[PDB]
Structure formats: C-alpha cells, structure tokens
C-alpha cells in the first residue's frame, strides 16, 4: 500500500511548494 | 509498518497547516 | 521499501524545519 501513503507524501509535497513560494513573497516585502 | 511512517507523515501535515497559517497572518501583515 | 519514502518524509521535514524557521523571521520583522 505504497501508492497512497506516496499521495499523501505528495500532498504534503505541494502544501510545502505552496508555502516557500508565499514565504519568499513575505521576504521580499519585509526587506528594506 | 505502514502505521508509524503514517505518524511522521502526519506530523508533516500538522506542521505545515500550523505554518500555513502563520504565513497567513504575516501576509495579512506585510499587504496594504 | 519504507527506505525510500522514508527518505521523501524526510526530505519533506527539512524543508518544513526551514520553512519554519523562515517564518518566524518574518513574524519578528512584521511585529511591532
Ligand atoms: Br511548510
Ligand atoms: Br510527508
Ligand atoms: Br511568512
């Protein structure tokens, strides 16, 4: 049962992608 | 052993819906 | 196989850990 534990994985994957690419957003706006 | 990876996997999960948010509250912030 | 997607969780936390840790330097620098 490999193949939905992996789809969970990925989920988490995207959530992830998802989250550094809004960080980095914050970043740069809280930069000088 | 499908049972204890499904723990980390959730503890994943837990982290990053903690994160989101927080990353929620830090856009609200930083916007006009 | 639980060696492998093993390894993706893994990969998965640390990129969390970092993420979280990002997070809060944005958090101190939206405070007051
Ligand atoms: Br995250
Ligand atoms: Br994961
Ligand atoms: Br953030």
Redesign the pocket.
Known sequence: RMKQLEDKIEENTSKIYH?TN??A???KL?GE
């Open positions: 989250n809004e960080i957003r914050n970043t809280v």
